[PDB]
Point group: C4
Chain length 244, copies 4
């Protein structure tokens, strides 16, 4: 009864806000240069991944648990959500990321705060190289999300939340060495806003993840497992007036 | 057939006593300053999470496997358990934590004993900051618990025990840096009793987790996925006389 | 058609032999003092656990996947298997552990070989203190096994293999500091035969685990979730003549 | 309508190529000597394993998700796939490994490139010893794979993808110390071609993994769980003309 005007839509947008707040808080907080014991690569990798896995499990049934502007955009291109759901989700994700980083800023002691765990290019490498890396990291993540959340799947699914979570961990085990690992425009945007700190190569953390995810969406939803759908039904999905 | 008098209820209370004993024993025992090899952050975090994850799987069918007064009180507020089940569970949890911490004291060598892994603030974290952190830590946990044990769930659940387990691990990966990570007033209370060691900040490890869990319950059960029910049925739940 | 004469029984005894060989090989192999990169506590605990988890998944459907004399004896006392099945399994497990430890001895370089990762009591720990620890370590494991493999379970079980595996990992995260972590008489026995090195505290690695596992069986099968059966039926299980 | 010619087959070959590309990229990428933070044993092992778990979850429904010439050949021997499928999968796997290694070479900084994480025999290990290790490592993996993907299984399977994945992690926790851990001829071939360097022991990374997986297939499909097909049916599978 009008997609945008429903209580379900209000709960979904709020859930996207809340999930991204919690994600960023946990992600950045585990990555700070704590004097007591500097976090290791695997430590940070599992922290980010377990945050997504926990949040996917907890708030996934409310909104779909995107928690990531690149994932949301790819689902739009692959014809899975409406334009307006995409807009509100992305908006909620960026606001959530800012809040999460802001809350972290207010609780972290001064010796730990540092750069608030912003993404940083590895200066032994170039923009183009780093962007290719982020394209790959987000590509495998996206592909795993689409495969784990496809209601058509007949292969035993296991735990979608834990599979998706551990894909985030995988991305970090390589990506940290290149860019601090983004895979998520909101993860990069949040702390950059709170610390008023945008590096020249900030575009990498938007273009890489988005292109990676969208490529996975094209591959998955259009080449590997296409669906039925008339053109008018495809237009209806974009508008949010599709009756299945 | 009169809740408090049933064999089921007796087993439930025993299981909450036993689960907290084993949890606290393993948790604290993994976190001591073993001179042979000092436990790392990730190592401690996984021990706490796998303990909860193993105990959820093993004893959860008996009692619901709360293993945590903050969670028990949250489920009361959310109208899921009776007042008497709450009192007995909390009592069983506190006594169990003391038993586990006591058993550890009796087995651990002198060079490893230390302060028996009591909770303690970072020397640069204030009580106010610690408070907000514990709230967030227990909030994500409670939310993951309620989502993973909801009978109404249609989303593939995966493993609720391991999801809840890894959500605890998630908590520790940030929490240890602030308060040694509590998320659980019984976990804080057990070693504090055995060592007769209550820091001024001890209240944080009670209020922080309880408020965090209660907010998650209010959100989950009254805002996101309400049950409705008549006000006489709600009262019947509190008094232990509700029939489905 | 006669238990010991069935093809299924032969496959089962072989499976227990093979699983224990592979388990002990991976277990000990991961724990050698490799000079290029000394294995960390978490490294070893995960290896042991992932070994059991992988072998439960792969060979459990053939034999039950005990891979542990303590578990087998516990299932005998809990009236789940026959006496003759118990005898052959233990035999196969002990022989398997010698094979695995022997094979590792054959491939490992001497700069890493050391004691072939035999169990050893911590200097600062009495035999009796190690006794209580080994009891508890094996107790939580057995309890998790019985809960995860119970065909009466209505609770989402998730992955019994991974849950059981991670329980082994949990055991090592504390137990390594006390005894190198046994939980398994065959695991202690294997390298001790190959190295011809039996420590004074060797009985601990038998009594601790066996007592811990048996207590868990009594608790689970006779107190928490019993099955009321006639005396003659119980005797029929022991003799291997029972028909459900 | 002729196996090789179908749309499904074309996708399956591509999926194997893409899976091996991504696998090798992440695997080698996680293993480079990054001077800022040298990857730990457990760090590398989880990267490799989680790569397989993620790719098995994502692309397994498309191809069977072999990502490994040893597994593919084992499945041919075990009468599970056609000769033509085995040929194209192996070919696609090897081309994918080169592509993945090639892409890493293009993005990795000079200070971390090193040997591009080619497998390398331990100086203190003989070729014959490394041979036995690789046999055992791939044996346990193949066994886990066949048990987890058997549609005749009644025991709860849990997460096939993650069980297989963590089996790979298990392989590495022992294998890295001997050979850098191969378990997969493509994984060894890829960077060897790109770097134009083949070790004297390179055959071990082929023969070891292939023998181990084939033995596992003979044990699983002909000794433990046979299917009793007629000889004409077996020949039909080999030719890809089998109808169930
Ligand atoms: C690092 C450790 C990773 C541990 C991964 C645990 C894998 C989880 C894992 O193994 O989950 C397996 C799920 C599969 O679902 P199902 O069909 O068995 O249950 C019915 C199902 N449709 C439902 O109702 O949800 O098991 C649920 O209990």
């Amino acid at each position: 009864k009008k997609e945008v005007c429903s209580v379900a839509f209000l709960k979904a947008v709020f859930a996207e806000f809340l999930a991204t707040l919690i994600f960023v808080f946990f992600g950045l907080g585990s990555a700070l240069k704590w004097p007591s014991a500097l976090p290791t690569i695997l430590q940070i990798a599992l922290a980010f991944g377990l945050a997504i896995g926990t949040l996917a499990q907890a708030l996934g049934p409310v909104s779909g648990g995107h928690i990531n502007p690149a994932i949301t955009l790819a689902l739009l291109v692959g014809n899975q959500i409406s334009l307006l759901r995409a807009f509100f989700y992305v908006a909620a994700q960026l606001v959530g990321a800012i809040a999460g980083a802001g809350i972290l800023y207010g609780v972290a002691p001064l010796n730990a705060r540092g750069n608030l765990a912003v993404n940083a290019l590895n200066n032994n490498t170039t923009q183009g190289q780093a962007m290719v890396v982020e394209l790959i990291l987000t590509f495998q993540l996206a592909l795993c999300i689409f495969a784990s959340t496809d209601s058509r799947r007949t292969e035993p699914v296991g735990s979608p939340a834990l599979s998706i979570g551990l894909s985030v961990t995988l991305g970090h085990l390589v990506g940290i060495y290149f860019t601090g690992c983004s895979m998520n425009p909101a993860r990069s945007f949040g702390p950059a806003v709170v610390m008023n700190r945008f590096s020249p190569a900030h575009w990498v953390f938007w273009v890489g993840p988005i292109v990676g995810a969208v490529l996975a969406a094209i591959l998955y939803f259009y080449l590997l497992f296409p669906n039925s759908l008339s053109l008018s039904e495809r237009v209806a999905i974009i508008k949010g007036t599709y009756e299945p």
